[PDB]
Amino acid sequence: NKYDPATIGQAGSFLNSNIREIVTAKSGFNNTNVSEATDYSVLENARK
Amino acid sequence: TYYPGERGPYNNNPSFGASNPSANFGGIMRALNSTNFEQGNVEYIQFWVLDPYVGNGESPATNAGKIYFNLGEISEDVLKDGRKQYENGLGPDQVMVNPQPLWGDVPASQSLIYAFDTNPDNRKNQDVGLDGLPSSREGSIYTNYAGEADPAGDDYTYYLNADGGVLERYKNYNGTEGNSAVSINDPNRGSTTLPDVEDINRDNTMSTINAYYEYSIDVKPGMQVGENYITDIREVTNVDLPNGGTTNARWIQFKIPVSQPQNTIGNITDFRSIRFMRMFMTGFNSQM
Amino acid sequence: SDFLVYPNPTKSNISFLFDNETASVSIYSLLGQKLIEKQITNQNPVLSVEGLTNGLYFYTFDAGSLHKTGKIIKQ
Amino acid sequence: DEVKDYTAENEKEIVDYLAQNNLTAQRTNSGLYYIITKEGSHPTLNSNITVIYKGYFTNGKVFDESTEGVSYSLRTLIPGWKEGIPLLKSGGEIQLFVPAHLGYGSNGNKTVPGGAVLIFEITLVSVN
Amino acid sequence: TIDMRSAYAWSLASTPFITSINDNTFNANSNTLEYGFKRAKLSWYTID
Amino acid sequence: VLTSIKNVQINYTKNSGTVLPGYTPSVGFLGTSKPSLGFVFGSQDDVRYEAAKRGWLTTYQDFNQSFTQVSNKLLKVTANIDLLPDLKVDLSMDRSYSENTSEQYSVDPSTNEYKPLSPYTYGMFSISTVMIKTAFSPSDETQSAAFDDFRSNRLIIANRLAEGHYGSGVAIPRYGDANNPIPAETDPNYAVYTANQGYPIGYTKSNQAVLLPAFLAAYTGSDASSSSTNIFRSFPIPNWSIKYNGLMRYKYFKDKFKRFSLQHNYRASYTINQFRSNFDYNSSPKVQDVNTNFYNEIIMSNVNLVEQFSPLIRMDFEL
């Protein structure tokens, strides 16, 4: 799909470079109906 | 203790003394350990509270207000700028956000542990509050109160270091600046050792969602059983006071049923994830 | 890592470090017996005392023949 | 530290291949030889290209064939591609004669020994 | 019961919403310092 | 002068294993030798191609079982030296290398040619090294000479690796030349290009091939311009244990001592808990990742340098 992390914001993707930052995580989507708990979720020091 | 006539922390209202005090709020919030209310079957919020219109230190009969509770996903960005402020990452030699984000210096690094070191100079440079400024550079942000000693209104004073009655000694006990002194023998004894972070549930992430349920009780002189979630009233006739006198008391039990919210803010539909609890007083005219 | 109860004065669960053999922990907690009786395994040692009450509780962890007792604190 | 120079050997191998097989190849200023077999109706340094390339050695033994269109970013490719692909529009076919320093280096990888000239037959079909 | 009256477990709160997410009663929707203009003083404690 | 050594204990374990699924033929009453007589007795030689040619591997073209190999090596050299009559030194050299290989396979319907499919490798590595050359340098939250060496060696290692890659016949392309200029802020690679200016194109500061040997050279005291830029080592440097009951002999027979012994142990290990083969390290023309780094043949997540003086010293004496 257009959520490919290898094609972030190249020509027609739905993700901007801001998807890489936690501060602008929601600004990193080119879509409209995006929510912080349904579409995505951010962690800041997630442990593997 | 709620002072509607006193300016709150990080408040920069140019006209606060002329504003109607009933339009202000004073609130606290907390993280719940168990967030699954459906599995835990959390039925209600029960509190025994003391009627503030009966005893010796009674409020005026016209000082009526509301206490709101909120349960759910509450934005823990206390200073709303989109960035998490942790004060163990501040200092003169640290990297800050290149433009100041509307509330003060915020560290540009990534937090690892929410803990200060034990160097008193670092502690003085770091324990400066949620503003990120050490009460000397606060006036640049909080222009309307730059002439005061504490422009942001967030300095911490120890209760044994203050003056007046018991209530006045605790008036500034919740300030976020200077409340983590290294030594326990300092005249302003700490009251905590953790940095003040915009992350309440300690999962390293600053939430920004606002999907919660809102409940409220009225605080009025003549509250009676059967309404306002009042389920019980215990009237204490004569209590022996330490000064040799006697006073009357009125304890009121509220049971707010979680299952019947008065309002819904945001897009929340179930109690399967209730991560935060907030309560704030509003609508009062005088100290309550 | 012999046997640990990491948060002893806890407002939350118990993490109960021990050996491989599973556990049969129980709680009586101030007076008489009010058995909780969970079934802690080797790699999922999480209890539940967050709701009961606040007090000095008695626990009897049972790793087969390793019956180690002690007191926890609900804050 | 065992660095090895292959520029002269790679160029002589390219010249020998272009002599034995009747081909005329234009040369860049970096040692890359390209032949534009056909064109269609220019990708930049930032462009997701789609290719049907086939890469073999000078002896014709294919080391990487792709008969189905594969999408790349053109910034992650070997320098030979970075210098050859922007020389044609969509729908065209180019043939590259990448030397070792513009290809997989002087140390090589699996199936590609170091200091080897690589011949590519690329069919740029999309500049998506 | 889960006890919620520990003093040190409460912290300063964000500006709340009253009627809905569209209710700007306490300036909870603003993106400036006005976000804090309606905050009065609140002390929470347990008398030592 | 080498007559000091008393013993040289040498242990060398080498385990192996092979799982070959899809092997059609059955066995006999007393056993079998159908794949090869050696295989029944652990030959470990390649029998996949022989079995495929003989025609007794599965002919299913969507076979979903993996041919698997395992190989563990474990070397435990130990030696004793008596340089002085009362000074006893014990040296140890430990090495461990576990490697598991897996792949899927098919058999060509014609010519019965065995075709491997997506082979990959993983495993663990451990060796006894020596990092005492930087053990006693001051180190805290404000200063570290070893960490300064780590920061400095990245460029040296990157230049060495670029000379290895670009075979010195052309100028090494870097991130600041006219061929690769710093992009405008709108480009995603603005910060990556700016952060590494003098570094070669494929070898940035964050490239594992750059900062793993830099880390080893910095924290083992070696020089980055000559140290080995490989992931695995070959010769384990000895760790040691010195015991010295010798001071009593000189004048302590009447100097208030009746027992006296110094002791010292140094044990340092270099460990990779899990290295894997990179599926992106292939023959495709895509040779750089999002960070503009060259793909590495072997990729890991963590490396551990564990040094231990246990004890650094032990003065035990009875008056």
E contacts of B8 (beta carbons < 8 Å)? 36, 39-42
Q: Which residue has the tokens 């050594």?
A: F5
- Given a contact cutoff of 8 angstroms between Cβ atoms, the answer to whether D69 and D124 are in contact is no
E contacts of B16 (beta carbons < 8 Å)? 37
Please state the φ and ψ torsions of residue D20, each to the nearest 5 degrees. Answer: -65, -45
Provide the residue type at D118 as one letter: L
What's the CA gap between B66 and B44, in Å, rounded? 18
Measured CA distances, B207 to B24, B46, B52, E20, F70 (Å):
24, 27, 35, 19, 47
Enter the DSSP assignment of D101: T
Taking alpha carbons only, the member of A22, F215, F172, F281 closest to residue B77 is: A22
- Quick check: helix, strand or coil at residue D43? coil
Measured CA distances, F149 to A40, B84, D107, F134, F145 (Å):
41, 34, 28, 10, 6
Cβ neighbours of residue C11 under 8 Å, at least 6 residues apart?
A: B33, C50, C74, C75, E3, E6
Task: Return the axis-axis angle of helices F145-165 and F208-219, rounded to nearest 10°.
Answer: 140
- Given a contact cutoff of 8 angstroms between Cβ atoms, the answer to whether B105 and B132 are in contact is yes
Q: Which residue has the tokens 């019965």?
A: F112
What's the CA gap between D30 and D10, in Å, rounded? 12
- Quick check: helix, strand or coil at residue D115? coil
Q: Which residue has the tokens 């326990």?
A: B184
Enter the DSSP assignment of E33: G
What's the CA gap between C47 and C49, in Å, rounded? 7
Cβ neighbours of residue B31 under 8 Å, at least 6 residues apart?
A: B200, B201, B202, B275, B276, B277, E9
Q: Which chains touch D (3 or more CB pairs under 8 A)?
A: A, F
Taking alpha carbons only, the member of A14, A17, A35, A37 closest to residue A26 is: A35
3-state SS string over A1-48?
CCCCHHHCCCCCCCECHHHHCCCCCHHHECCCCCCCCCCCCCCCCCCC
Enter the DSSP assignment of C13: -
Measured CA distances, F183 to F155, F188, F196 (Å):
22, 9, 13
- Indicate contact of A with C: 3+ CB pairs under 8 A: no
Rg (CA), chain B: 21
What's the CA gap between B154 and E39, in Å, rounded? 12
**What's the gap in Å between the CA of F190 and the closest CA on chain A?**
12
| Tokens linked to A28 | 């990193």
**What's the gap in Å between the CA of E5 and the closest CA on chain B?**
9
- Quick check: helix, strand or coil at residue E12? strand
* Cβ–Cβ contact A5 with D under 8 A: no
Measured CA distances, E26 to B23, D10, F17 (Å):
8, 74, 71
The 8 Å CB, 24+ separation contacts for D62-65 are D63/D111, D63/D112, D63/D118, D63/F283, D64/F283, D64/F284, D64/F285
Q: How many CB atoms lie within 10 A of CB F104?
A: 16
- Quick check: helix, strand or coil at residue C4? strand
What's the CA gap between F218 and F207, in Å, rounded? 16
Comparing alpha-carbon positions, the chain D residue that sits nearest to F290 is D76
- Given a contact cutoff of 8 angstroms between Cβ atoms, the answer to whether B13 and E30 are in contact is no
What's the CA gap between F115 and F317, in Å, rounded? 70
CB contact under 8 A, C11 and B34: no
Q: Which residue has the tokens 């899809």?
A: F22
What's the CA gap between D35 and D44, in Å, rounded? 19
Q: Which residue has the tokens 């295989």?
A: F39
Question: Mutate which of D49, D50, D71 to test chain A, going by most A C-beta atoms within 10 A?
Answer: D71
What's the CA gap between B144 and F152, in Å, rounded? 49
Question: Residue B62: is it exposed, middle or buried by C-beta count within 10 angstroms (0-12/13-18/19+)?
Answer: exposed
Q: Which chains touch A (3 or more CB pairs under 8 A)?
A: B, D, F
Terminal CA-CA length for chain A: 26
Taking alpha carbons only, the member of F157, F189, F165, F187 closest to residue F175 is: F189
Enter the DSSP assignment of C17: B
- Quick check: helix, strand or coil at residue D55? strand
One-character DSSP codes across F175-244: SSSSSSPPPPTTSTTHHHHHH-SSSBSS--TT-HHHHHHHHHHHHS---TTTS---SS-SSPPPEEEEEE
Of B84, B205, B209, the CB nearest to A43: B205
Cβ neighbours of residue B190 under 8 Å, at least 6 residues apart?
A: B179, B180, B181, B184
Of F167, F226, F289, the CB nearest to D101: F167
Comparing alpha-carbon positions, the chain F residue that sits nearest to D7 is F169
- Given a contact cutoff of 8 angstroms between Cβ atoms, the answer to whether F173 and F180 are in contact is yes
Phi-psi region of C7 (alpha: psi -120 to 50; beta: other; left: phi over 0): beta
- Given a contact cutoff of 8 angstroms between Cβ atoms, the answer to whether F269 and F94 are in contact is yes
Cβ neighbours of residue F122 under 8 Å, at least 6 residues apart?
A: F99, F100, F274, F275, F276, F277
Taking alpha carbons only, the member of F96, F88, F81 closest to residue F128 is: F96
CB contact under 8 A, C50 and E1: no
What's the CA gap between F274 and F99, in Å, rounded? 10
- Given a contact cutoff of 8 angstroms between Cβ atoms, the answer to whether D106 and F316 are in contact is no
What's the CA gap between D117 and D103, in Å, rounded? 8
HSE at residue D65, side-chain half, CA atoms within 13 A, is 4
Q: Enumerate the β-bridge partners of residue F239.
A: F92
What's the CA gap between B196 and F221, in Å, rounded? 41
D contacts of F226 (beta carbons < 8 Å)? 1
Cβ neighbours of residue A41 under 8 Å, at least 6 residues apart?
A: none
CB contact under 8 A, A6 and F290: yes
Domain boundaries, chain D: 3-128
**What's the gap in Å between the CA of D15 and the closest CA on chain A?**
38
CB contact under 8 A, E1 and C51: yes
Taking alpha carbons only, the member of F131, F125, F130, F129 closest to residue F271 is: F125
3-state SS string over chain B?
CEEEEEECCCCCCCCCCCCCHHHCEEEEEEECCCCCHHHHCCCEEEEEEECCCCCCCCCCCCCCEEEEEEEEECCCCCCCCCCCCEHHHCCCCCCECCCCCCCCCCECCCCCCCCCCCCHHHHHHHCECCCCCCCCCHHHHCHHHCCCCCCCCCECCCCCCCCCCHHHHCCCCCCCECCCCCCCCCCCCCCCCCCCECCCCCCCCCCCCCEEEEEEEEECCCCCCCCCCEEEEEEEEEEECCCCCEEEEEEEEEEEECCCCCEEECCCCCCCCCCEEEEEEECCCCCC
Taking alpha carbons only, the member of C37, C71, B12, F77 closest to residue E33 is: B12
Enter the resolution in angstroms: 3.2
Q: Which residue has the tokens 């993707």?
A: A13
* Cβ–Cβ contact F167 with D under 8 A: yes
Question: Mutate which of F290, F292, F301, F302 to test chain A, going by most A C-beta atoms within 10 A?
Answer: F290
Residues F296, F119, D81, D98, Cα dihedral to 10°: 90
**What's the gap in Å between the CA of F186 and the closest CA on chain A?**
10
Judged by CB atoms within 8 Å, which residues 108-127 of B form the interface with E?
A: none
What's the CA gap between E10 and F108, in Å, rounded? 70
Phi-psi region of D99 (alpha: psi -120 to 50; beta: other; left: phi over 0): beta
What's the CA gap between F92 and C72, in Å, rounded? 47
- Indicate contact of E with B: 3+ CB pairs under 8 A: yes
| Tokens linked to F275 | 């290295």
* Cβ–Cβ contact A7 with D under 8 A: yes
What's the CA gap between D71 and D50, in Å, rounded? 4
| Tokens linked to B145 | 């109160």
What's the CA gap between E14 and B29, in Å, rounded? 8
| Tokens linked to D56 | 């073999």
3-state SS string over B2-66?
EEEEEECCCCCCCCCCCCCHHHCEEEEEEECCCCCHHHHCCCEEEEEEECCCCCCCCCCCCCCEE
Please state the φ and ψ torsions of residue F20, each to the nearest 5 degrees. Answer: -120, 100
CB contact under 8 A, E38 and B25: yes
- Quick check: helix, strand or coil at residue D20? helix
- Given a contact cutoff of 8 angstroms between Cβ atoms, the answer to whether B10 and B154 are in contact is yes
Q: Which chains touch C (3 or more CB pairs under 8 A)?
A: B, E
What was the elucidation method?
cryo-EM
Rg (CA), chain A: 11
What's the CA gap between B188 and B123, in Å, rounded? 13
Q: Which residue has the tokens 């491989």?
A: C20
CA E11, distance to chain mean position in Å, is 9
What's the CA gap between B246 and B56, in Å, rounded? 9
What's the CA gap between F28 and F36, in Å, rounded? 14
CB contact under 8 A, C11 and E3: yes
Rg (CA), chain C: 11
Q: Which residue has the tokens 């609130």?
A: B27
One-character DSSP codes across chain F: --TTEEEEE--EEEEEEEE---------SS---SS-HHHHT---S--HHHHHHHT-S---TT----EEEEEEEEEEEEEEE-SSSSEEEEEEEEEEEEEEEEEEEEE-TTTT-EEEEEEEEEEEEEEEE--GGGSSS-BSSS-BHHHHHHHHHHHHHHHHHHHHHS-SSSPPPBSSSSSSPPPPTTSTTHHHHHH-SSSBSS--TT-HHHHHHHHHHHHS---TTTS---SS-SSPPPEEEEEE--HHHHHTTTTT-SEEEEEEEEEEEEEEEEEEE-TTSSSSSB-B-TTSPBPPSEEES-EEEEEE-TTS---EEE-
Taking alpha carbons only, the member of B4, B28, B27, B26 closest to residue B16 is: B4
CB contact under 8 A, D46 and A12: no
Instruction: Report strand pairing: D92-98 vs D118-124.
Output: antiparallel
- Given a contact cutoff of 8 angstroms between Cβ atoms, the answer to whether B229 and B217 are in contact is yes
Judged by CB atoms within 8 Å, which residues 166-225 of B form the interface with E?
A: 166-167, 170-174, 176, 192, 196, 200, 210, 214
- Given a contact cutoff of 8 angstroms between Cβ atoms, the answer to whether F53 and F108 are in contact is no
What's the CA gap between A32 and B210, in Å, rounded? 18
CB contact under 8 A, C51 and E2: yes
